[PDB]
Design a protein around this ligand. Structure first.
Ligand SMILES: O=C(NO)[C@@H](Cc1ccc2ccccc2c1)NS(=O)(=O)c1ccc2ccccc2c1
Ligand SMILES: O=C(NO)[C@@H](Cc1ccc2ccccc2c1)NS(=O)(=O)c1ccc2ccccc2c1
Ligand SMILES: O=C(NO)[C@@H](Cc1ccc2ccccc2c1)NS(=O)(=O)c1ccc2ccccc2c1
Ligand SMILES: [Zn+2]
Ligand SMILES: [Zn+2]
Ligand SMILES: [Zn+2]
Ligand SMILES: [Zn+2]
Ligand SMILES: [Zn+2]
Ligand SMILES: [Zn+2]
Ligand SMILES: [Zn+2]
Lengths: 299, 294, 288
């Protein structure tokens, strides 16, 4: 049987909130079978929990935001990408504030935290969502598509014609496993223009955001002193975001995603569209010695 | 006088439908005086005819689509460009499906079929639509203009800033006083991005679309093994498109067209706007061919 | 005390109207204290006056247009930039038509005409509007912002990815405590594509527009035989426009403006937003 997985131990970490600029306290905890990933606001009394599911998504402006009433948690997608990447089905993510710390702008830190906590296989079948037919959404020139595929494959293309981007890799495809996620995707940082940072920092927004947690460009060049982690870092980050946003489905996906200039809003719209078309997907498990077409890291 | 023209004989051909990926059966037939170009769906019972006229254009998303009720024929513009280019006034176009076959992505195959069918002059004056005053339309950054001109002239400019287009010819003008439609325009293939083909195919659209019927590019380079036919092939295909779309006026044009990033939608809008402005045009004939534009 | 300033003498000029292609007559005249800059349609009877104030701006399609009822004056910003740059508080600008003549497409001619008129210091304190809190507006990808600053600074960035604009300065800052408006900004000409000119002409518009009053480009190159007045002429002209548009506040600014692809419409929207946000600004005079 292909089994569900959680964390072996509790692990804690801290970092700055992108929005607040204040220190946020993060705790990852084990969770029972069929819990999924659940965020909890432990600064609140009573504590408020928000399951990481598509139906709980609120705003999708800059990051993916989860909401329950007036209570929110944003900046969820990078951590969720790491949970998806390492095959973590069940976990609690406790936070002292309304956002997951941005860390270095990638999913790398979260991969390392999960690894440090250790993996624990659980006595319950892992559920997968298999794409059975094509589903797509578009918003202007932006497109996001699911097609059937025996495995998990994520493709993405951006299109920037600014000098800084002309001739750089702007398309990539990853045939997904834990191992191809950790080394080829997880450390890809988010990115934006310095003029966009300037604009947010004026009007006192994104107070924790800097070159320390993003690739920062201007019209002509990359401004980070140490350059890029990967030549394809820009497009790899979009793949990272897509993996994280798609994990709001609540289970590992068996299929193929293709994005063109897609963002959190379109990713979420694609999920909603899939979920509502019951003919386009099925829940599957792999029992009695059968195996899944996706490879995950051994505990 | 300058006489109306039809085909001398029937001619048949086949080609894959861009949309369906299925073989489509095409027949070009002679037609009486004042018929214009009429498309006929022979797969339907009863047969449904749609005159190739500006008023009959439904959608314009990827190609020019003629519509009558729930029946449509799209990808009409490349064939219409050849009819316009060779001066065919009257003809029936019978089709087994909701699209004209895409052939090689240009008007070249239709030039052969029309010329092989032969030209037949008819005992009636050929009517022309002469532009008397400027008319224009815009949509976002896109523009389309008619300007008075003693002849027929089509100018077009595109504006792509992707590396694959930076530096390539993206503007051209053809004055048909001196210049041949067949030699200078007809063989220019349509074009687009491989990422768009991928997407369309995933939607079961463009099931017949490939490098065999388009110039296919990515962000940085032309993907076709043997590259372009002409250096200016991109912008010349836009001129081909304009000539075909403008022939939905129903008559040869005496005037100048100028497009900037104009597509089938804006082209049709220009026609509808022109038609509504009754003082911006007139119909003319030439009892002495010597008085016509060269 | 820092005093208000008007013109010393009346000065006249003529030029082609950008829209009409007709000869337009202009007169600059002194004005009393607290008049501000006032445009006058002196071709009409009775004469119609439109104060150059943010509340009187109508259309912002290609230029800034002032309106009172059905009477308009457009293309005001280049002249206004000159008035602002030379510290002219009070003046009348009389016109024979609904547009300020375009001249050479820059503020240079207006600087020279104002300079020719001479300066007259007046017996009243000059009022400044000081920015005390950040104010911002946005429209699509365009942004305009005021930030507190001890002086006057204009920062601007454009973003064109056409070959003709690549490899040029597309961002500039001017701190007017160190930089001279007259030598570093005022001569920057307006600019646009020849295809845009051709389109306007076919609509019987911009009949007076040409290489004689603009930098004209195509997709790949500058078409003017003479090149550029400054390497950064394009962005400097946007700064020039910003200065003109901002002078519709009615007084000189103490603060910093930052624009990204901001045009006349967004510039005006920023002014109207600032005016309404009373806690973000104050009027100040200087006794010494
Ligand atoms: O990767 C993201 N979401 O998954 C980023 C995308 C983003 C959006 C806007 C930006 C503006 C300027 C710079 C970088 C930017 C990236 N969204 S985010 O994680 O919420 C984020 C937003 C703003 C930031 C500013 C500066 C550093 C890091 C940031 C991250
Ligand atoms: O020339 C045309 N109409 O007159 C083409 C324009 C077009 C639009 C979208 C494309 C996407 C990718 C490649 C080429 C494309 C060309 N419209 S079309 O004749 O309907 C057409 C559409 C899509 C195609 C895909 C692939 C080959 C040929 C095509 C033709
Ligand atoms: O500087 C301006 N306003 O402050 C110009 C901006 C502009 C707009 C559109 C253009 C089209 C083509 C060429 C240049 C252009 C400049 N607006 S304007 O002063 O009203 C103006 C408009 C159109 C013109 C065409 C030709 C020359 C000069 C022009 C000035
Ligand atoms: Zn679909
Ligand atoms: Zn750019
Ligand atoms: Zn991200
Ligand atoms: Zn591009
Ligand atoms: Zn075409
Ligand atoms: Zn361009
Ligand atoms: Zn200007």
């Amino acid at each position: 049987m292909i089994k569900q997985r959680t964390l072996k131990n509790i692990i804690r970490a801290t970092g700055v909130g992108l929005h607040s600029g204040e220190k946020v306290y993060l705790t990852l905890k084990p969770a029972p079978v069929d819990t999924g990933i659940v965020f909890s606001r432990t600064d609140l009394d009573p504590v408020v929990e928000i399951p990481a599911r598509a139906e709980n998504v609120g705003e999708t402006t800059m990051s993916t935001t989860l909401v329950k009433g007036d209570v929110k948690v944003d900046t969820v997608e990078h951590l969720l990408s790491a949970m998806a990447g390492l095959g973590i089905d069940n976990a609690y993510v406790e936070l002292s504030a309304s956002e997951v710390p941005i860390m270095d702008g990638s999913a790398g830190p979260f991969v390392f935290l999960i690894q440090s906590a250790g993996l624990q296989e659980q006595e319950a079948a892992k559920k997968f969502i298999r794409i059975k037919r094509e589903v797509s959404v578009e918003e202007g020139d932006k497109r996001a598509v699911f097609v059937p595929f025996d495995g998990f494959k994520v493709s993405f293309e951006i299109d920037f014609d600014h000098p800084v981007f002309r001739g750089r890799t702007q398309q990539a495809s990853v045939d997904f496993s834990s191992t191809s996620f950790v080394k080829e995707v997880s450390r890809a940082r988010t990115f934006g223009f310095m003029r966009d940072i300037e604009y947010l920092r004026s009007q006192n927004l994104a107070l924790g955001g800097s070159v320390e947690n993003a690739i920062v460009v201007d019209e002509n060049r990359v401004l980070n002193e140490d350059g890029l982690r990967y030549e394809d870092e820009f497009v790899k980050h979009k793949i990272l975001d897509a993996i994280g946003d798609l994990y709001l489905l609540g289970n590992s996906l068996i299929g193929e995603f293709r994005g063109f200039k897609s963002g959190h809003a379109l990713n979420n719209q694609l999920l909603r569209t899939l979920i509502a078309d019951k003919d386009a997907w099925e829940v599957v498990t792999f029992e009695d010695a059968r195996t899944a077409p996706i490879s995950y890291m051994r505990p």
